[PDB]
Amino acid sequence: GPVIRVAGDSTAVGEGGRWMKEMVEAWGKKTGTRVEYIDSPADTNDRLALYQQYWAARSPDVDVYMIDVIWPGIVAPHALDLKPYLTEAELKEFFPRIVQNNTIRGKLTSLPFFTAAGILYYRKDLLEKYGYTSPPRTWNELEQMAERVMEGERRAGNRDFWGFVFQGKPYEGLTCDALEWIYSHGGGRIVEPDGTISVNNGRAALALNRAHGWVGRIAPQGVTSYAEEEARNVWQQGNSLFMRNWPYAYALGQAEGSPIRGKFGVTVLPKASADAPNAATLGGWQLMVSAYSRYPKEAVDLVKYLASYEVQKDNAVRLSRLPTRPALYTDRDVLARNPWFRDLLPVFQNAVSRPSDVAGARYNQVSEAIWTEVHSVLTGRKKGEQAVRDLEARIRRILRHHHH
Ligand SMILES: OC[C@H]1O[C@H](O[C@H]2[C@H](O)[C@@H](O)[C@@H](O)O[C@@H]2CO)[C@H](O)[C@@H](O)[C@@H]1O
Numbered sequence: 001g002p003v004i005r006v007a008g009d010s011t012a013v014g015e016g017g018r019w020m021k022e023m024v025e026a027w028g029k030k031t032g033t034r035v036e037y038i039d040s041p042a043d044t045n046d047r048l049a050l051y052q053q054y055w056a057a058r059s060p061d062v063d064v065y066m067i068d069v070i071w072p073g074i075v076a077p078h079a080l081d082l083k084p085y086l087t088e089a090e091l092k093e094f095f096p097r098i099v100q101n102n103t104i105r106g107k108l109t110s111l112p113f114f115t116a117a118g119i120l121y122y123r124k125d126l127l128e129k130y131g132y133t134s135p136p137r138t139w140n141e142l143e144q145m146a147e148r149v150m151e152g153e154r155r156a157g158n159r160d161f162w163g164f165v166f167q168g169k170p171y172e173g174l175t176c177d178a179l180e181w182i183y184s185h186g187g188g189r190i191v192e193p194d195g196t197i198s199v200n201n202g203r204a205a206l207a208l209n210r211a212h213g214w215v216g217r218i219a220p221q222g223v224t225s226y227a228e229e230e231a232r233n234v235w236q237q238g239n240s241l242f243m244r245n246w247p248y249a250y251a252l253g254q255a256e257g258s259p260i261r262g263k264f265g266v267t268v269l270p271k272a273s274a275d276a277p278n279a280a281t282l283g284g285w286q287l288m289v290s291a292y293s294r295y296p297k298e299a300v301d302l303v304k305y306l307a308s309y310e311v312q313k314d315n316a317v318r319l320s321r322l323p324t325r326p327a328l329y330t331d332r333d334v335l336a337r338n339p340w341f342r343d344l345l346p347v348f349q350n351a352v353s354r355p356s357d358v359a360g361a362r363y364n365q366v367s368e369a370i371w372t373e374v375h376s377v378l379t380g381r382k383k384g385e386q387a388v389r390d391l392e393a394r395i396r397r398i399l400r401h402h403h404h
């Protein structure tokens, strides 16, 4: 009978691709339906270009796509409206914020699958070894701790040891890190939900100069080419005091044979001062049925299964990825495995979004300008002051005549 073909997640990032294919195969086995998994590149913006090839061709060759939180405004024409396939009570089992994110001009483009937010990973053993009893609350403290711990560990002979690793490659991940820097210095949201391009200000400038000041000092020079997995691999081998990353790194760090198993915790990212806002960029992925699927009914059944309570629970327990169902945050098994799901719930609830709603279908162009100008500051090519000014002008061009 039909073959239900799924493109979602990547075998190049942690266990997400492997686990995704396993779930899709379990749905196939359970329902007696043939399925195939199509693998994707690591980086979201590369996945977007890949999938856009299928969409442009109206291709029936993928039935189900895992789409980024930043995509609904872009991909809406390519999505089957799910709204008629769910009751109001079913829909309300998901967080309203994400359902709303996924709903474009009344169309429910996708079901919420897992959410994410940026967080600070930190080595507890190393903090204790150097006399610190809490992870840093401010960026200055992160720097001070990173310098002292690095000096010590280098002297003890770990020539691989760094203070801080993050995503500084020129891609969507840098847009994520950079929104956290700017917002946590009181510099705004780059583009505000009302359309105001606010990034040209002295706080945003300072946030970027500060990041520049990390490169080759407390962070490796090569951090300007790091995505999620490059940062994670330095961290996970035991070679970084701190890491900025998404929740999925926690379960990987705790796995049997991880050199850092039991040595780390997580907390909110630092901020410039006590009265700045906490910054955690909102991430996460959704499940879309293709408008070009020849098998909508079967594809919707697979998507409902993937987004169900027990599959999200498995995602939580085994891959430490955040559910999109409030009821899982009180589940005894989810919580015992990841107590920090409860500790940082308010951080996840206040996560700051990238400007995907306000930029809509032009978001990818906006983000590319953002990561290229930010990157120019990380490389030392421009100061923050010049970069935010150039960014403002580029975003103004990009969004001219665009209204939300
Ligand atoms: O790189 C930007 C991208 O990061 C996150 O996507 C992660 C995801 O959270 C992880 O579970 C795993 O799938 O790695 C992905 C990175 O390739 C955000 O979820 C996403 O919104 C963001 O655009």
Ligand SMILES: [Ca+2]
Pocket (backbone or CB within 6 Å): 115, 116, 246, 247, 248, 249, 320, 321, 322
């Ligand atoms: Ca994650």
